[PDB]
Design a protein around this ligand. Structure first.
Ligand code: HEM
Ligand SMILES: CC(=O)N1CCN(c2ccc(OC[C@@H]3CO[C@@](Cn4ccnc4)(c4ccc(Cl)cc4Cl)O3)cc2)CC1
Ligand SMILES: CC(=O)N1CCN(c2ccc(OC[C@@H]3CO[C@@](Cn4ccnc4)(c4ccc(Cl)cc4Cl)O3)cc2)CC1
Length: 455
């Protein structure tokens, strides 16, 4: 625990064995907000015994995320016991990650994204139908239930060329199982013990103990094999992975499960945050509709080219991701002793970039608390540092599905907003309050009321 002292870097005093984890009672976002304000440009703390160095300087951020990615800052914090999911790209290391990256990245080229628009359009139709049902009754909507089903429908069909039709089944197996893959929350004596005694991880790995429920991984393990069967019995993410067979049968499933979960969880999450922000700013919700109407007059179906035309939509999406970067923190492990922009960083340290905190630094963002889409306007855009604003990370190891998620959320949003308007109702949580999880999640689902437009 003497490390940060010895290095001259400040921070909260750790407890023996525990480190600074009891500070996690208010969530990672408040912890990082506090430290940033108290300690300044750079601070340090201990997740159990693991030193974590938070950095704030934009050029220093470019160094660990971009310049020295391959050389020293390549991998993320080790995570286990993880079992067969060690193959997964998001937790793969060094050259294994490198070749997994160059394999799967063509999945999301412009051109392949264009192909996905007519495929998503079908589910866009089922989306507007389900919400219309809720606009007729006047009943409240748990948005995570409808945008989730939509996210799940979109990512299965674009990646595996299979229509699991989640949007009509409220009790679809692909959504029940996939949502029960994270969940871990604060103070679970499992994850808590693993942060404090990470030397236990090997034993758990040896006893075949796993973070993910085997029930849930069995179903996902099965489902993907069935989907792989269909393609081999008559070019997307699936196809791209079959062709490499250098993927093992189990490595393929690992990658799939990443994309399935990322598809479902990430997309619907952000969508709920966007929807909330619009419903609580109808001034902004209307200005967006005006734009959607102008670029696509009388309910004209959206296209890849027309999405790129909607400047205000992109502003609104950007501004939500500023307040709600679901990853909260970027991180990368230091492979070897190094000096960067003047600062010594020892081997083994976790270097952490506090996205959430920096998106609210009064130094770069005037009135950081407020939802103001005008921040990202063409005339204002050039004062934003691209290393301060990092909803999708930066460099060779950024979010592989960035552009897909942006297009797909914009697609849903267009289909929704050209048809409906969203008003806050009874059950709606104002102000919004966030869970104490590993990804950014609201405590109690976002509930809004749905009105139809004109007549
Ligand atoms: C708007 C929704 C999304 C947000 C805000 C988001 C954000 C992020 C962030 C911040 C990271 C870490 C990047 C870094 O460490 O620099 C990441 C990684 C990753 N994301 Fe996303 N993401 C989203 C959607 C998606 C989607 C739709 C997919 C797949 C279809 C996906 C797949 C991945 C993968 C595979 C990684 C690990 C990359 C690697 O280590 O090679 N994400 N994402
Ligand atoms: C399959 C896959 O791609 N991935 C597996 C899941 N990965 C992931 C996601 C979130 C995440 O944050 C987990 C949370 C973050 O904080 C702790 C400790 N911790 C682990 C890593 N960094 C900090 C924690 C400490 C003590 C207590 Cl009581 C509860 C928790 Cl919670 O786990 C850690 C890892 C993301 C990548
Ligand atoms: C709280 C904290 O310290 N941290 C929060 C989590 N941070 C983190 C670390 C790694 C990471 O890798 C992206 C991986 C890639 O896919 C997912 C979902 N996802 C999130 C953003 N983009 C995709 C994912 C897939 C499957 C499962 Cl089971 C769980 C998760 Cl998530 O995260 C995404 C986020 C690590 C640090």
């Amino acid at each position: 625990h003497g490390l940060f002292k010895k290095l001259g870097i400040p921070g909260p005093t750790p407890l023996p064995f525990l480190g600074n984890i009891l500070s996690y009672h208010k969530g990672f976002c408040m912890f990082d907000m506090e430290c940033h304000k108290k300690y300044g440009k750079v601070w340090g703390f201990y997740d159990g015994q693991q030193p974590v160095l938070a950095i704030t300087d934009p050029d220093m951020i470019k160094t660990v995320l971009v310049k020295e990615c391959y050389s020293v800052f390549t991998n993320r914090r080790p995570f286990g016991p993880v079992g067969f999911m060690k193959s997964a790209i998001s937790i793969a290391e060094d050259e294994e990650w490198k070749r997994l990256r160059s394999l799967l990245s063509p999945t999301f080229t412009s051109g392949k994204l264009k192909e996905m628009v007519p495929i998503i359009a079908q589910y866009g139709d089922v989306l507007v139908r389900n919400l219309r049902r809720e606009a007729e009754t006047g009943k409240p909507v748990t948005l995570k239930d409808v945008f989730g089903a939509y996210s799940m429908d979109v990512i299965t069909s674009t990646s595996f060329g299979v229509n699991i039709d989640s949007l009509n089944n409220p009790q679809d197996p692909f959504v029940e199982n996939t949502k029960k893959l994270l969940r871990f929350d604060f103070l679970d004596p499992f994850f808590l013990s693993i942060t404090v005694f990470p030397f236990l991880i090997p034993i758990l790995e040896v006893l075949n103990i796993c973070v993910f429920p085997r029930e849930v991984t069995n179903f996902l393990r099965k489902s993907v094999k069935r989907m792989k069967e269909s393609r081999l019995e008559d070019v997307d993410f699936l196809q791209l992975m079959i062709d490499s067979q250098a993927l093992s049968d189990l490595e393929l499933v690992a990658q799939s499960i990443i994309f399935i979960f990322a598809g479902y969880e990430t997309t619907s999450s952000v969508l709920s945050f966007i929807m909330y922000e619009l419903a609580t700013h109808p001034d902004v919700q209307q200005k967006l509709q005006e734009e959607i109407d102008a670029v696509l007059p009388n309910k004209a179906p959206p296209t890849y080219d027309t999405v790129l035309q909607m400047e205000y939509l992109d502003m609104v999406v950007n501004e939500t991701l500023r307040l709600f970067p679901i990853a909260m923190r970027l991180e990368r492990v230091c492979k070897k002793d190094v000096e960067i922009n003047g600062m010594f960083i020892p081997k083994g340290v976790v270097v952490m970039i506090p996205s959430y905190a920096l998106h609210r630094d009064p130094k770069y963002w005037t009135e950081p608390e407020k939802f103001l889409p005008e921040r990202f306007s063409k005339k204002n855009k050039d004062n934003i540092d691209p290393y301060i604003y990092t909803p999708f990370g930066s460099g060779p190891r950024n979010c592989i599905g960035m552009r897909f998620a942006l297009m797909n959320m914009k697609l849903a949003l267009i289909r929704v907003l050209q048809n409906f308007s969203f008003k806050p109702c009874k059950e709606t949580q104002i102000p919004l309050k966030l869970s104490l999880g590993g990804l950014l999640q609201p405590e109690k689902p976002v509930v809004l009321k749905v009105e139809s437009r004109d007549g």
